[PDB]
Short mmCIF file of C-alpha atoms and ligand atoms in Angstrom, two decimals:
data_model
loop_
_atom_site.label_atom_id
_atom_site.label_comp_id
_atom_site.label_asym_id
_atom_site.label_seq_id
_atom_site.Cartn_x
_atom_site.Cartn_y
_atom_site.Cartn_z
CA UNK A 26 -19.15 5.06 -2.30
CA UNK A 27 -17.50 7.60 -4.71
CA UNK A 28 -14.60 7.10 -3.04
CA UNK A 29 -13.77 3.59 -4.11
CA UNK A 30 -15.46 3.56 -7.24
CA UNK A 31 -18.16 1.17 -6.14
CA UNK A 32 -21.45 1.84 -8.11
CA UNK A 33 -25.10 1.84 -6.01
CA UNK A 34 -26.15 -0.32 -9.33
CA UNK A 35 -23.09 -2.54 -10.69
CA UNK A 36 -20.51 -2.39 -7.76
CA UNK A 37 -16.87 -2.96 -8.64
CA UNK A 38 -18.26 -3.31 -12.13
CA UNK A 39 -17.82 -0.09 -14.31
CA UNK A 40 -21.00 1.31 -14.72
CA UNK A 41 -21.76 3.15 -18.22
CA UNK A 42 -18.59 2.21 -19.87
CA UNK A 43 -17.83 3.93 -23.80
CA UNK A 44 -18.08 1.83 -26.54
CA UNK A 45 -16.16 4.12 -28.69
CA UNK A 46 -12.61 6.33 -28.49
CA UNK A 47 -11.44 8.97 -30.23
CA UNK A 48 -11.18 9.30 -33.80
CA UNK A 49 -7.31 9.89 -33.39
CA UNK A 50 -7.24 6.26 -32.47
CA UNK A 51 -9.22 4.51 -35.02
CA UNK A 52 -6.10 2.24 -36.54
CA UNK A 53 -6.74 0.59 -32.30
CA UNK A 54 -10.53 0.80 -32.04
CA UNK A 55 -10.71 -1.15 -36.23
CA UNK A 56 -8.49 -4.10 -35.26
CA UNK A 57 -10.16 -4.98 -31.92
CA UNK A 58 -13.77 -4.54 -33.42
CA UNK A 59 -12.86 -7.34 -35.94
CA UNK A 60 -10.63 -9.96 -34.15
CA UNK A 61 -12.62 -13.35 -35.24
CA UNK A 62 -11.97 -12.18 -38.33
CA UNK A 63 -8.38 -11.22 -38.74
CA UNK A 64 -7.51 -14.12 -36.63
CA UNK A 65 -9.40 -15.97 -38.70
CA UNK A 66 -7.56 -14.65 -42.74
CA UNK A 67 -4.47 -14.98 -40.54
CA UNK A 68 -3.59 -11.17 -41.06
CA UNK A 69 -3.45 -9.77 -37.47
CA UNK A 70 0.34 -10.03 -36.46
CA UNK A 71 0.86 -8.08 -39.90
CA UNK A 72 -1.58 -5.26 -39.42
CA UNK A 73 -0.30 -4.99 -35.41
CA UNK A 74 3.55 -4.74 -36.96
CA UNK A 75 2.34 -2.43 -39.09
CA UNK A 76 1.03 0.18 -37.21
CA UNK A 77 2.39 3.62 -35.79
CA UNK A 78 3.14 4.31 -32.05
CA UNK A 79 -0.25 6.65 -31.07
CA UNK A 80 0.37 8.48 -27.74
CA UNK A 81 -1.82 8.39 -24.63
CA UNK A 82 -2.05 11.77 -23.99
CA UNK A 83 -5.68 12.10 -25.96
CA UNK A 84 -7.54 9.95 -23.91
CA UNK A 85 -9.38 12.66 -21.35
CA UNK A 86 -11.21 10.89 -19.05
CA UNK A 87 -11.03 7.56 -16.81
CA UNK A 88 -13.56 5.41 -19.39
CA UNK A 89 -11.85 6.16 -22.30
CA UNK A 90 -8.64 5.28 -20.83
CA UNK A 91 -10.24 1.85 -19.83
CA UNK A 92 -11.37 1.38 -23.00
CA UNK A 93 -8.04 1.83 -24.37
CA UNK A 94 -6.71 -0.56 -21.82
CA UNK A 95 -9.42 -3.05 -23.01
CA UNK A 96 -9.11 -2.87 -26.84
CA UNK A 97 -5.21 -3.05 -26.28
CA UNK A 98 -5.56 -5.79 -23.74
CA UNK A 99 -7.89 -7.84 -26.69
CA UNK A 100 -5.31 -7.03 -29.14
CA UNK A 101 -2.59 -7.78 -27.36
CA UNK A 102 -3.68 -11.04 -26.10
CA UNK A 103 -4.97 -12.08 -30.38
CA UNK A 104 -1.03 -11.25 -31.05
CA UNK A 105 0.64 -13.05 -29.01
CA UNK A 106 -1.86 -16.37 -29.06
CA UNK A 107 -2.49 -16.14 -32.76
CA UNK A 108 -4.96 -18.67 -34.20
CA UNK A 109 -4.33 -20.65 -30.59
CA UNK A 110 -2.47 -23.55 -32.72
CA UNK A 111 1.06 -23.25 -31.12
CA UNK A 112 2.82 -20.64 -33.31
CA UNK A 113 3.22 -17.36 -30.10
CA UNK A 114 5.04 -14.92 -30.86
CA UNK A 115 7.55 -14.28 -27.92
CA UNK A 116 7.34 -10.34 -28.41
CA UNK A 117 5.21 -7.34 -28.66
CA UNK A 118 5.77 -5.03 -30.95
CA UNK A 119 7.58 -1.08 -29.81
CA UNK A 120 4.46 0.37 -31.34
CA UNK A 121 1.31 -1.40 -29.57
CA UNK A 122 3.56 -2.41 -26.32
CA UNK A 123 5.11 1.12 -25.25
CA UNK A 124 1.81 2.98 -25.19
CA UNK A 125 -0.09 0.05 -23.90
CA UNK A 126 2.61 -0.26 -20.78
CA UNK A 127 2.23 3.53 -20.29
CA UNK A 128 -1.57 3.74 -20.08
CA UNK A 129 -0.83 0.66 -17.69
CA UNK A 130 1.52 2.12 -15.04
CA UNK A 131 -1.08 5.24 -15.45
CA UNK A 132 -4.17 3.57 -14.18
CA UNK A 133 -1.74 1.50 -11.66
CA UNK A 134 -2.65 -2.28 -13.47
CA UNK A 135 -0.43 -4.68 -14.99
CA UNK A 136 0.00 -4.45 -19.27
CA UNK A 137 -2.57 -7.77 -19.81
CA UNK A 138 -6.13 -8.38 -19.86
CA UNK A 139 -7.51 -8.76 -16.56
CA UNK A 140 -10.85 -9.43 -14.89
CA UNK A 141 -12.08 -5.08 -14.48
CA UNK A 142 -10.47 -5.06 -18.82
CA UNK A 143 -12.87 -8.11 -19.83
CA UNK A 144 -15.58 -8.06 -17.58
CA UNK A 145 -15.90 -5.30 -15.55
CA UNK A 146 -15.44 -3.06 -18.67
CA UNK A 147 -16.64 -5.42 -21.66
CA UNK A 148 -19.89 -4.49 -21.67
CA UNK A 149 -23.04 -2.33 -22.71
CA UNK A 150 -26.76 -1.58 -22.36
CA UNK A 151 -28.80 -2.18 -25.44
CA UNK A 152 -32.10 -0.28 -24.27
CA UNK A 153 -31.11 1.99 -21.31
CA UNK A 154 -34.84 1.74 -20.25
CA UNK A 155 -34.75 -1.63 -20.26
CA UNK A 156 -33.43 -3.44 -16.71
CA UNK A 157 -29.91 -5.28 -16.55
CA UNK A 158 -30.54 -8.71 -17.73
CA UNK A 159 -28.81 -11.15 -20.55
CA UNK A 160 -31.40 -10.48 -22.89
CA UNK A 161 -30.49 -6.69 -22.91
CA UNK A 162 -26.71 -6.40 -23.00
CA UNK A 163 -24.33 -7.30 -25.27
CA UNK A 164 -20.25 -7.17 -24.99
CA UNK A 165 -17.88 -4.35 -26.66
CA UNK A 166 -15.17 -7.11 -28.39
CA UNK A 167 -14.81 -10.71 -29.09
CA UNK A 168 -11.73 -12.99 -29.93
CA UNK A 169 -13.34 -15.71 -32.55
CA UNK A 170 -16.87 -17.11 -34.11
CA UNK A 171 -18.38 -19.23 -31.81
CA UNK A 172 -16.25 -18.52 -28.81
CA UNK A 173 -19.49 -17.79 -26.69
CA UNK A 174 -17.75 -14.70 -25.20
CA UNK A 175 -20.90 -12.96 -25.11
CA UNK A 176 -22.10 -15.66 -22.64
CA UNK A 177 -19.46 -15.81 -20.82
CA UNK A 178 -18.19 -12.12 -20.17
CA UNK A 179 -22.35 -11.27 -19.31
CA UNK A 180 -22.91 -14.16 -17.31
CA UNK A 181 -19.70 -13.31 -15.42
CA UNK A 182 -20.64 -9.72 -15.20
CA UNK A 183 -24.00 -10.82 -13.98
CA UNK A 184 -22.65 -12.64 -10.83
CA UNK A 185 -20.45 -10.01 -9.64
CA UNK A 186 -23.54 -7.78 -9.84
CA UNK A 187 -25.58 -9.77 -7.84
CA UNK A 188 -22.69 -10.71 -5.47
CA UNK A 189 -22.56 -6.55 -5.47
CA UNK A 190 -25.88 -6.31 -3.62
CA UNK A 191 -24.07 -7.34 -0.38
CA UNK A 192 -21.61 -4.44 -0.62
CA UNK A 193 -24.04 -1.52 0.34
CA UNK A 194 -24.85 -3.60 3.48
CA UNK A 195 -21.09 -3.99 5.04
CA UNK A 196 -21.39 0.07 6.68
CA UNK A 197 -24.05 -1.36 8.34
CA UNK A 198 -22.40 -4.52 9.50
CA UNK A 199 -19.20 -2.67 11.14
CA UNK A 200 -21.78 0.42 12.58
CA UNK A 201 -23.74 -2.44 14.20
CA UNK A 202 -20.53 -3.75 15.61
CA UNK A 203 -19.41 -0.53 17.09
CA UNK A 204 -22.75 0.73 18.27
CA UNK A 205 -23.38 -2.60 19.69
CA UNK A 206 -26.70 -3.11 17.50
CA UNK A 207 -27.28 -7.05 17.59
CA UNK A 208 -30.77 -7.21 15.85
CA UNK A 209 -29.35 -5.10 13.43
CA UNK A 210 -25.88 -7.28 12.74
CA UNK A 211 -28.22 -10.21 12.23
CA UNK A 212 -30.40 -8.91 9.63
CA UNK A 213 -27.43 -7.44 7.63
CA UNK A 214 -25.82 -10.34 8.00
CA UNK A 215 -28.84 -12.24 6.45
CA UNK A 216 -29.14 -9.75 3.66
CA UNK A 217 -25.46 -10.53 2.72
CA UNK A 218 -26.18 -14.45 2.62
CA UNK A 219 -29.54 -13.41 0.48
CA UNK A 220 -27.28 -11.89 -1.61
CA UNK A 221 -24.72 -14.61 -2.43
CA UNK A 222 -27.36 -17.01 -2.71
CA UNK A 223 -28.85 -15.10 -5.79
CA UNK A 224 -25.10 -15.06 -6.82
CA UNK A 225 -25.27 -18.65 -7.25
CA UNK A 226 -28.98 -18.58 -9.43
CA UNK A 227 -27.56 -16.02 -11.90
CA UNK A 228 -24.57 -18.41 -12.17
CA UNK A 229 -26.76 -21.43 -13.43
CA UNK A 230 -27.72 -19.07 -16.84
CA UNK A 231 -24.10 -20.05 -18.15
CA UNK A 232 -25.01 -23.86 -19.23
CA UNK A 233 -27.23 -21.80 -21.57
CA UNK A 234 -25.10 -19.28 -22.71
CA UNK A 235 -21.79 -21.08 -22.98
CA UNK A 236 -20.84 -24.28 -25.14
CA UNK A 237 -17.72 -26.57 -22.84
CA UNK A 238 -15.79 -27.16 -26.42
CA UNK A 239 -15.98 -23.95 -27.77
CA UNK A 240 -15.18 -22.54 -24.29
CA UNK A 241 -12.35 -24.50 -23.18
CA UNK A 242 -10.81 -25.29 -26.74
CA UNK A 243 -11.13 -21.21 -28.57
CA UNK A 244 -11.81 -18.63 -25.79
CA UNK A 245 -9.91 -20.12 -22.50
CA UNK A 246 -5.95 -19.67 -24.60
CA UNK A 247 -7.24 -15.81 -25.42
CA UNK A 248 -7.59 -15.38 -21.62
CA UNK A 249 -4.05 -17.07 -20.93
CA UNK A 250 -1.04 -14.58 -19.66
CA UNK A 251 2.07 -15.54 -19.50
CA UNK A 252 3.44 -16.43 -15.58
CA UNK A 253 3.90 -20.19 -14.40
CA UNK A 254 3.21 -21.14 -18.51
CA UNK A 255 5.62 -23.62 -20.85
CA UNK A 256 4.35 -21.53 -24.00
CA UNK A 257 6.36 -18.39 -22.22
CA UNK A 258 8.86 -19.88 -19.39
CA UNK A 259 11.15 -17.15 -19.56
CA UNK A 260 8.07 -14.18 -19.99
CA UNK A 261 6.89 -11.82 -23.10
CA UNK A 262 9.40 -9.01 -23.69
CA UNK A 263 7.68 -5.88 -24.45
CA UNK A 264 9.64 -4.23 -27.05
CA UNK A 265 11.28 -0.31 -26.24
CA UNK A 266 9.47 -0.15 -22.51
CA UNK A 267 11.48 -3.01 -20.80
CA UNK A 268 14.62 -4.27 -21.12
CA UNK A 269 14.34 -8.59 -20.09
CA UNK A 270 11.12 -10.70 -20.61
CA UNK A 271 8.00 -10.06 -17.66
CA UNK A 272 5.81 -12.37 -16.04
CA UNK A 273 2.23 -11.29 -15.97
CA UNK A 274 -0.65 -13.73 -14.81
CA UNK A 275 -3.02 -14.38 -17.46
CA UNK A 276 -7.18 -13.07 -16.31
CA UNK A 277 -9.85 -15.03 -13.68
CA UNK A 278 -12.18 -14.49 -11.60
CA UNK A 279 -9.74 -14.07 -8.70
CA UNK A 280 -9.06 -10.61 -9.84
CA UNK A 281 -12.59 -9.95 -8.67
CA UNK A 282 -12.72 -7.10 -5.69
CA UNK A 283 -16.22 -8.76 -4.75
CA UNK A 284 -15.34 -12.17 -4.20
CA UNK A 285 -12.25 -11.64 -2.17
CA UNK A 286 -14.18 -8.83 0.04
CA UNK A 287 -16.70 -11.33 1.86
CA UNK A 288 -13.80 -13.60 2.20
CA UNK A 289 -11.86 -10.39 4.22
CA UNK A 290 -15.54 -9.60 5.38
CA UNK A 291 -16.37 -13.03 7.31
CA UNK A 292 -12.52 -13.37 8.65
CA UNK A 293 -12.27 -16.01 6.25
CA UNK A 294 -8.47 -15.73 5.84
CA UNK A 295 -7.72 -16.61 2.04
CA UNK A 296 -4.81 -14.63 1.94
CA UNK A 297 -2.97 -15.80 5.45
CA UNK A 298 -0.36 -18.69 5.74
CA UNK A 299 1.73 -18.61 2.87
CA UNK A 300 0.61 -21.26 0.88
CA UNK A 301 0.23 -21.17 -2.82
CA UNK A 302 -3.01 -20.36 -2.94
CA UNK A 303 -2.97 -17.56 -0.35
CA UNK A 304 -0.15 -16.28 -2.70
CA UNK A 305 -2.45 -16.27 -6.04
CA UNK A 306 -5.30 -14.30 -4.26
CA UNK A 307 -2.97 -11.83 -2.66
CA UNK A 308 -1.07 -11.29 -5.64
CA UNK A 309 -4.16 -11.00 -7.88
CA UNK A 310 -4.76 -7.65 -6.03
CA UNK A 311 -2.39 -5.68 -8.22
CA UNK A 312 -4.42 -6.68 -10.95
CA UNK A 313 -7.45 -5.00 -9.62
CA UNK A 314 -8.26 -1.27 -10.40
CA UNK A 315 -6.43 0.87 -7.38
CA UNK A 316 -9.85 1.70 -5.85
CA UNK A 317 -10.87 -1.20 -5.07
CA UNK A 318 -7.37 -2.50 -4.04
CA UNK A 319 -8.06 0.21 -1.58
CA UNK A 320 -11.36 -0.81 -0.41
CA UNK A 321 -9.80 -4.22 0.18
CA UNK A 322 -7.58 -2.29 2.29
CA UNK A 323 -10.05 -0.55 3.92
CA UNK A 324 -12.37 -3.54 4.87
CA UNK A 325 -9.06 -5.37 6.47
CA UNK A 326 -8.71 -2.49 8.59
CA UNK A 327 -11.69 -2.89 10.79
CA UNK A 328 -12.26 -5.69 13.67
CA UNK A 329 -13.58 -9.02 13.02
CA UNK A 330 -16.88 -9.34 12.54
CA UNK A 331 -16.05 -13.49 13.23
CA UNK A 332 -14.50 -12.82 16.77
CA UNK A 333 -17.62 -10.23 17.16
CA UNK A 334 -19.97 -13.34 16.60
CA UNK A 335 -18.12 -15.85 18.57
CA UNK A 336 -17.67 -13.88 21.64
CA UNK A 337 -21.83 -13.40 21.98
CA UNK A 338 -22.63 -16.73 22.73
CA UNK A 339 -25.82 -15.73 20.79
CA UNK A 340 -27.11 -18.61 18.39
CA UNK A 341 -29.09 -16.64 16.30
CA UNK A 342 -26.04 -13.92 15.31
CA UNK A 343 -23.72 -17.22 14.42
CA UNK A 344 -26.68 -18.73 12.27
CA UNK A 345 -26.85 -15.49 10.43
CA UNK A 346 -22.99 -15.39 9.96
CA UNK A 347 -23.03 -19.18 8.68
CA UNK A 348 -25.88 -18.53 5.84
CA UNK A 349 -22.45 -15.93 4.60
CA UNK A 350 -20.50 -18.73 4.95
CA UNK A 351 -22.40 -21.61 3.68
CA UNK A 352 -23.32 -19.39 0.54
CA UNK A 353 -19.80 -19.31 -0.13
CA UNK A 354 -19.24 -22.78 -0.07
CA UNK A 355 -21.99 -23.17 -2.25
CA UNK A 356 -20.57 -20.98 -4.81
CA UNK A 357 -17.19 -22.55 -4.93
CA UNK A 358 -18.79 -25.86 -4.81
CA UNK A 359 -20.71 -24.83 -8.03
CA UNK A 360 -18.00 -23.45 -9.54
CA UNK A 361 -15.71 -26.41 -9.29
CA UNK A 362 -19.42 -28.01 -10.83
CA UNK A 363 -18.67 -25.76 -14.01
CA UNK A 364 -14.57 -26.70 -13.76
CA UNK A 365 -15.32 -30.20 -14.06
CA UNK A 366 -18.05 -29.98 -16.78
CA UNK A 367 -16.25 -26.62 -18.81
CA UNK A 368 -12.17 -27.14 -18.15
CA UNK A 369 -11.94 -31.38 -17.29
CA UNK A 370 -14.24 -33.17 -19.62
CA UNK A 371 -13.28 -30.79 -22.35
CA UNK A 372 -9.52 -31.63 -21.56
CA UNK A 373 -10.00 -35.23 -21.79
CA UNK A 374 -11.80 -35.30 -25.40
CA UNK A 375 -9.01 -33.43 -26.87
CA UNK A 376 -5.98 -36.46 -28.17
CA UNK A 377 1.04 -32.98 -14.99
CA UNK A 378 -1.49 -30.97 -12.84
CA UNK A 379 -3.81 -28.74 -15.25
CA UNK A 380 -3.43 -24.92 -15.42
CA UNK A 381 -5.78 -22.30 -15.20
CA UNK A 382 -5.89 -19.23 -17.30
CA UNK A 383 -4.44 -17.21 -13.92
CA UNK A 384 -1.87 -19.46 -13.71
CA UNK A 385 -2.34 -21.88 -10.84
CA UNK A 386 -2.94 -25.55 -9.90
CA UNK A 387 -6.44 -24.87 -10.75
CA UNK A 388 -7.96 -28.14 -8.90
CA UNK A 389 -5.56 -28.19 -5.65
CA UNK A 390 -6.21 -24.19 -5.97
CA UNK A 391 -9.83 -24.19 -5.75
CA UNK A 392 -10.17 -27.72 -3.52
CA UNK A 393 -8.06 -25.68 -1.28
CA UNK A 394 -9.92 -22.11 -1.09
CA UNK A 395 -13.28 -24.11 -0.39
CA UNK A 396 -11.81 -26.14 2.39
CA UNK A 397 -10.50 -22.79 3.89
CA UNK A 398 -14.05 -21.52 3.71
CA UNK A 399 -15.40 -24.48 5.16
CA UNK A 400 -13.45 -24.31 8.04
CA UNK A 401 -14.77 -20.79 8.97
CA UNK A 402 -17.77 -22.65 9.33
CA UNK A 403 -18.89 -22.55 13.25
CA UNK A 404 -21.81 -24.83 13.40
CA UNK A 405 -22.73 -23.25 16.73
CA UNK A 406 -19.63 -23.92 17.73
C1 HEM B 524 -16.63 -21.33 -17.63
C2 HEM B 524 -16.58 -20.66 -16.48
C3 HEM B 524 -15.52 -20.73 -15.45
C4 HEM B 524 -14.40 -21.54 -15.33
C5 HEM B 524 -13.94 -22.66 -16.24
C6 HEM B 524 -13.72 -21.16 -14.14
C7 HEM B 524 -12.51 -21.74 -13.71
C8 HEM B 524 -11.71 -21.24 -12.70
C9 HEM B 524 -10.37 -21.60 -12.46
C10 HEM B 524 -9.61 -22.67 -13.21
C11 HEM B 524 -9.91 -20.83 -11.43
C12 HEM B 524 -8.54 -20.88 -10.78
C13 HEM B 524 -7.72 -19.61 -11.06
C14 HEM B 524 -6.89 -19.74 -12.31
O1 HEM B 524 -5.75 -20.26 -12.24
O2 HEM B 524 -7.31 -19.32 -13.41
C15 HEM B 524 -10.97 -19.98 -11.04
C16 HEM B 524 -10.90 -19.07 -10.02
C17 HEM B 524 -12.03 -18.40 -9.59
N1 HEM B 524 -13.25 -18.37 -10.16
FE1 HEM B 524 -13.77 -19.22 -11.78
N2 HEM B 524 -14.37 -20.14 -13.57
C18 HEM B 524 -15.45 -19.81 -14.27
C19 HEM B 524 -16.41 -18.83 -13.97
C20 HEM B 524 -16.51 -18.16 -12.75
C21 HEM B 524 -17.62 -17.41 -12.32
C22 HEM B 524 -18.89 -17.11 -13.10
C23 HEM B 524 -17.34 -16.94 -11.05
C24 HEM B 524 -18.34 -16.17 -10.27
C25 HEM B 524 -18.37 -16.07 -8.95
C26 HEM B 524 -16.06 -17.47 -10.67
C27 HEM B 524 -15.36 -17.27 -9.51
C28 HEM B 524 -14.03 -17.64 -9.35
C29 HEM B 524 -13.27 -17.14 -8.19
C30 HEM B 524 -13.80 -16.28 -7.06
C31 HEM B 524 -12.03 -17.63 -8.33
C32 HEM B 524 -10.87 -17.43 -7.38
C33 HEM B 524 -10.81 -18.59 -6.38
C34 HEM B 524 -11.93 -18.53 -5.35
O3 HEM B 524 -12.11 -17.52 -4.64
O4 HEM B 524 -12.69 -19.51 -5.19
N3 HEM B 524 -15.58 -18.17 -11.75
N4 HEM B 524 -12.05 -20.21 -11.85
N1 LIG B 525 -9.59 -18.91 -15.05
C1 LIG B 525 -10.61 -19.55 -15.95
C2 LIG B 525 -11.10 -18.57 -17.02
C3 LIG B 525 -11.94 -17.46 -16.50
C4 LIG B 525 -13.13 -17.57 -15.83
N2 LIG B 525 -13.62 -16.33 -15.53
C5 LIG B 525 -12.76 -15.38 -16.01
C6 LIG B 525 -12.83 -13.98 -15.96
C7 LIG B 525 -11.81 -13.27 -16.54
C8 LIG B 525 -10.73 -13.92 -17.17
C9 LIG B 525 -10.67 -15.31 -17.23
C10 LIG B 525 -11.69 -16.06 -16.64
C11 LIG B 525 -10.04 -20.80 -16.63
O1 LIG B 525 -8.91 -21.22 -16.36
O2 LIG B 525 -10.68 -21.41 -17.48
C1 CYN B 526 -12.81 -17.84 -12.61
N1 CYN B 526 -11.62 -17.69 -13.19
#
C-alpha cells in the first residue's frame, strides 16, 4: 500500500534507505560515521559544541530527511550519554538541537532515536542481487567497538520483516469478513500465524549475533531517552527551540507498527483499560512514522475479526484464529527468554523494579502484555 508506506518486500521497514546526504552536511554525516571512536578519545561533546547551525531546507526528499533524523538521532543520543560512565550532559547544544527539533516536528516524530531512526532506517544491502539475509546487510552507524549493533539492529530488522509477511494478507481477512467468505478467512488467518511463527525462527539468529555483556553493559544506555529516568528526572532541555526541559521515551521495540497491528488485528486489546502498560503502547504511537500511525488507525476502524470468529460457532475458523494468537504468545514468551538471558543476568554480574530503554517496568510490562494476549486465547471456547 503506497498509501501507508508499507513496502510489498520490507513492510513498515524503509525499503532502499541512503547511506549518504548531501555534501552541504558533511560536518553531520563525519561525526556519526565515527562514533566508537570519538566516544572512545573522549572528543565528541567538543566537536558537537563546536559546530555551526546547518538548516534543513537542503534535504529534498523523504530518505534523506530520515537519514538526517538518524545520524542526528545517533549523535544526539553519543552527546548526551557520553562514554556511558555517569558524566550526561543535561543539554543539547542551539546548533545540533534546533535543526534536529525542526526536521522532527517536519516528519511528525519526537527529537530522539526511535525504533523507524535505528532499525527501520539503519540499514543497507551489500549485493542488491543477493536476497535479504544477515550475511548480506550491514548497518549505516554504530555507537562503540564491540557493541554488536550490527547484530542487533539486523536481527531486529529481520523480525519485523518476517512479521511483515502477514500484512499483505489483512485486505483479505476484512474482504472475507464482509463478503462472508469462511474458507477464505481461515486460510488467511493461517497464513498470518505461518507468518509469526517464522517471526519467532529469525529471532533465534540473535544468540549468534549478539554478546549479553556487551549488549546490556555498552549499547542498551545509547538506546536510553530520557522519560521516567533518575539520570534526567526533570527532562533534556534543548537549547534555542524550547523553553523548560522535555520528556521523550528512550527507543524499543514497542515503537514497532507491526507488532502492535496483529494485536489491533486479533481484538487483542493492548491499548484498552488504562493501565500502565496500555499507556506505554498507546503512547509509543507518536513515535512511529505518521503513515503507519495511520494504518494503525485504519485497521481499528474495521469490525472485529474476534467477535466475527466467535459468533460462527465454527471450530475450524477459531483454530485458525488461535495459531495468531498462540504465535504471539510464543513470541513474547521468547522475548522475555532473551530479557532474562540479555537485560537480568547481565544486571546481576555488574557490583527497585528494572527499567527498560522505553522507559517502563520492563518485567511487570511485558508479564503483563503476554497475559493480555493469553487471555484472547478461546480454546474453542
Ligand atoms: C536483546 C534484545 C531485546 C531485549 C533486551 C528486549 C527487551 C525489551 C524490553 C525491556 C521491553 C519493554 C519496553 C521498554 O521499556 O523498553 C521490550 C518491549 C518489546 N520488545 Fe523487546 N527486546 C529485545 C528484542 C526484541 C525483538 C527482536 C523483538 C521482535 C519482535 C522485540 C519485541 C518487543 C515488543 C513488541 C515490545 C513491546 C511489548 C510487547 O508488545 O510485547 N524485542 N523489549
Ligand atoms: N527496550 C530494550 C532495547 C531494545 C530492543 N529492541 C530495540 C529497538 C530499538 C530501540 C531499542 C531496543 C531494552 O530495554 O533493553
Ligand atoms: C524491544 N524493545
Amino acid at each position: 500500500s503506497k498509501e501507508y508506506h508499507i513496502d510489498e518486500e520490507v513492510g513498515f521497514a524503509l525499503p532502499n534507505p541512503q547511506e549518504n546526504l548531501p555534501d552541504f552536511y558533511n560536518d553531520w554525516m563525519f561525526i556519526a560515521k565515527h562514533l566508537p571512536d570519538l566516544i572512545e578519545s573522549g572528543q565528541l561533546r567538543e566537536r558537537v559544541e563546536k559546530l555551526n547551525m546547518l538548516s534543513i531546507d537542503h534535504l529534498t526528499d523523504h530518505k534523506s530527511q530520515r537519514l538526517a533524523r538518524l545520524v542526528l538521532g545517533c549523535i544526539t543520543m553519543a552527546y548526551v550519554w557520553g562514554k556511558g560512565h555517569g558524566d550526561v550532559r543535561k543539554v543539547l547544544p542551539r546548533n545540533i538541537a534546533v535543526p534536529y527539533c525542526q526536521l522532527s516536528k517536519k516528519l511528525e516524530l519526537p527529537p530522539i532515536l526511535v525504533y523507524a531512526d535505528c532499525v527501520l532506517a539503519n540499514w543497507k544491502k551489500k549485493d542488491p542481487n543477493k536476497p535479504l539475509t544477515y550475511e548480506n546487510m550491514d548497518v549505516l552507524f554504530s555507537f562503540r567497538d564491540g557493541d554488536c549493533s550490527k547484530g542487533f539492529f539486523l536481527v531486529s530488522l529481520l523480525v519485523e520483516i518476517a512479521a511483515a509477511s502477514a500484512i499483505k494478507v489483512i485486505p483479505t481477512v476484512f474482504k472475507a469478513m464482509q463478503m462472508q467468505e469462511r474458507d477464505t478467512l481461515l486460510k488467511a488467518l493461517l497464513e498470518i500465524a505461518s507468518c509469526l511463527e517464522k517471526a519467532l525462527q529469525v529471532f533465534h539468529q540473535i544468540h549468534d549475533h549478539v554478546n549479553p555483556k556487551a549488549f546490556f553493559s555498552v549499547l542498551r544506555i545509547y538506546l536510553s531517552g530520557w522519560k521516567g529516568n533518575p539520570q534526567l528526572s526533570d527532562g533534556l532541555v534543548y537549547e534555542g527551540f524550547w523553553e523548560d526541559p522535555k520528556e521523550f521515551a528512550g527507543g524499543s521495540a514497542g515503537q514497532s507498527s507491526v507488532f502492535q497491528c496483529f494485536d489491533v488485528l486479533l481484538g487483542i486489546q493492548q491499548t484498552a483499560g488504562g493501565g500502565h502498560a496500555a499507556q506505554f503502547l498507546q503512547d509509543m504511537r507518536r513515535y512511529m512514522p505518521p503513515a503507519h500511525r495511520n494504518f494503525l488507525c485504519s485497521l481499528e476502524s474495521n469490525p472485529s475479526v474476534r467477535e466475527f470468529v466467535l459468533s460462527k460457532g465454527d471450530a475450524g475458523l477459531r483454530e485458525a484464529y488461535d495459531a495468531c494468537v498462540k504465535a504471539l504468545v510464543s513470541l513474547r514468551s521468547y522475548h522475555l527468554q532473551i530479557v532474562t538471558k540479555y537485560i537480568l543476568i547481565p544486571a546481576s554480574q555488574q557490583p527497585l523494579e528494572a527499567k527498560g530503554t522505553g522507559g517502563t517496568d520492563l518485567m511487570n510490562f511485558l508479564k503483563t502484555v503476554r497475559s493480555t494476549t493469553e487471555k484472547s486465547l478461546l480454546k474453542e471456547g
